[PDB]
Design a protein around this ligand. Structure first.
Ligand SMILES: [Ca+2]
Ligand SMILES: [Ca+2]
Ligand SMILES: [Ca+2]
Ligand SMILES: [Cl-]
Ligand code: NA
Ligand code: NA
Ligand code: NA
Ligand code: NA
Lengths: 5, 473
């Protein structure tokens, strides 16, 4: 993922 | 006369108030009359359960949008694994309703709360920018418990649209006072990640917030870096309590955890602070955090006293937020002077790094010019360098007042040969210091390998003012 939680 | 909340899980919210003083001192702010009324917070995440029994009373459709599906409704997408519970948990920390017999209470339990559904999908630069730039004259505070991967080898930050959103937000948001962006510093502790390799936390436009366990320790997931500003409590080991908040499917959870829980608590405290003084600028807010945060009883091996007498740690910034102290100091706050920016190009020629490189430069910080800085805020070392194994590097920056900031610690998993391309390592540790004098940049190979590379650019960028100092602590 490019951005994660 | 102030009556604390009667909610059933409020007694389990050890981080809001206790006699132990291992808390964020939030009840003291409630007793001064600040509960968040009139303040608008938006949770940028995977959605918000807007019909939750403990959020519905505070929910604000004006603070909400669905960027993933391009519609106004940020309702989470329900799955068997409950993957999209993350934003609802964050929201309840900020603004869960008080005194309604359900779950616990938010820090700012009378604030209005919204959510941007933007993590449930491909999170592109445009997705981030539309989220960060949502309704910037209605939303006061944006909270983001997300970022680049915490694998300990990534160097990544906002691309062009997201960086433009930050600048537009702090310049024109909130009536020109500036959007408040609150960021979780990261969960990459196990990977030995550094939050200075994360351009969201590293940004001067965000308040990067780290975590402490109940017993006052650096949690397993914590990332150390010099860009962190302050700390709130979150989870730790299984004998330490966790965070109580609203859960997906209209439930209550006592086991919210990680960096993700710290940013919302900070956003709530900042909401209380804005209620105490609606005229605070985005920079005023960071000043308040620096002056009021409390190191006491937070354990770290790297506490150091900076040039104005404030204790600072790479795990904790200036320490634990103190809501009572924030709202008290905010009431008679004098707006800081306009921000000055002094750009100092340090190198005259490239320098081979080899085993160790030390670059010393005596600066005047724009003496005699309108951007003369005698009171530092953020400082950046914008570095361009090549190296064969990036994670073997450690980088330190020493201020004229003798404050040693770790810009980069070794990252064992970072095997990259890509080096750094004008990467703006940021430190908050020299806040309020006079930046005139000798700065020292240190780059060292922490491994026994025969590594090689070249530092080709070092721009020291100083932000700050030239007036209004306090007597050092
Ligand atoms: Ca939707
Ligand atoms: Ca409640
Ligand atoms: Ca990270
Ligand atoms: Cl700038
Ligand atoms: Na402005
Ligand atoms: Na930041
Ligand atoms: Na000096
Ligand atoms: Na010196």
């Amino acid at each position: 993922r490019r951005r994660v939680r | 006369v102030y009556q604390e909340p009667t909610d059933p899980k409020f007694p389990q919210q050890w981080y809001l108030s206790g006699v132990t003083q291992r808390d964020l001192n939030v009840k003291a702010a409630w007793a001064q009359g600040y509960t968040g009324h009139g303040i608008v917070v938006s949770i940028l995440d995977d959605g918000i359960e807007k019909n939750h029994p403990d959020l519905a009373g505070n929910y604000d459709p004006g603070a909400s949008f669905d960027v993933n599906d391009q519609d106004p409704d940020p309702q989470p997408r329900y799955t068997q694994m409950n993957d999209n519970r993350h934003g609802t948990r964050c929201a309840g920390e900020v603004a869960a309703v008080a005194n309604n017999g359900v779950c616990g209470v938010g820090v700012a339990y009378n604030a209005r709360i919204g959510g941007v559904r933007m993590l449930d999908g491909e999170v592109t630069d445009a997705v981030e920018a539309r989220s960060l730039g949502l309704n910037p004259n209605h939303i006061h505070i944006y909270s983001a418990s997300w970022g680049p991967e915490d694998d300990g080898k990534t160097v990544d930050g906002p691309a062009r649209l997201a960086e433009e959103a930050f600048f537009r937000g702090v310049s024109q948001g909130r009536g020109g006072l500036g959007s408040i962006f609150v960021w979780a510093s990261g969960n990459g502790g196990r990977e030995h990640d550094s939050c200075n390799c994360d351009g969201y936390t590293n940004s001067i436009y965000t308040l990067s917030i780290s975590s402490a366990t109940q017993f006052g320790n650096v949690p397993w997931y914590s990332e150390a870096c010099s860009s962190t500003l302050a700390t709130t409590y979150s989870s730790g080991n299984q004998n330490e309590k966790q965070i109580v908040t609203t859960d997906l499917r209209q439930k209550c959870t006592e086991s919210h955890t990680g960096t993700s829980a710290s940013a919302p608590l900070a956003a709530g405290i900042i909401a209380l602070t804005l209620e105490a003084n609606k005229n605070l600028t985005w920079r005023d807010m960071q000043h308040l955090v620096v002056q009021t945060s409390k190191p006491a009883h937070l354990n770290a091996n790297d506490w150091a006293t900076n040039g104005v007498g404030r204790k600072v740690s790479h795990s904790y910034g200036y320490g634990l937020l103190d809501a009572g102290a924030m709202v008290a100091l905010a009431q008679n706050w004098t707006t800081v002077a306009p921000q000055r920016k002094c750009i100092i190009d340090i190198l005259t020629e490239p320098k081979d790094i080899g085993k160790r490189l030390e670059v010393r430069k005596t600066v005047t910080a724009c003496l005699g010019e309108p951007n003369h800085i005698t009171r530092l805020e953020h400082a950046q070392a914008r570095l361009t360098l090549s190296y064969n194994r990036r994670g073997d590097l450690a980088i330190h920056l020493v201020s004229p007042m003798g404050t040693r900031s770790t810009l980069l610690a070794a990252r064992p998993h970072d095997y990259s040969a890509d080096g750094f391309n004008d990467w703006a390592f940021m430190t908050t540790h020299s806040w309020d210091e006079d930046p005139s004098g000798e700065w020292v940049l240190e780059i060292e190979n922490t491994s026994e390998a025969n590594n090689y590379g070249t530092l080709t650019k070092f721009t020291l960028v100083l932000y700050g003012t030239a007036s209004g100092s306090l007597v050092p602590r």
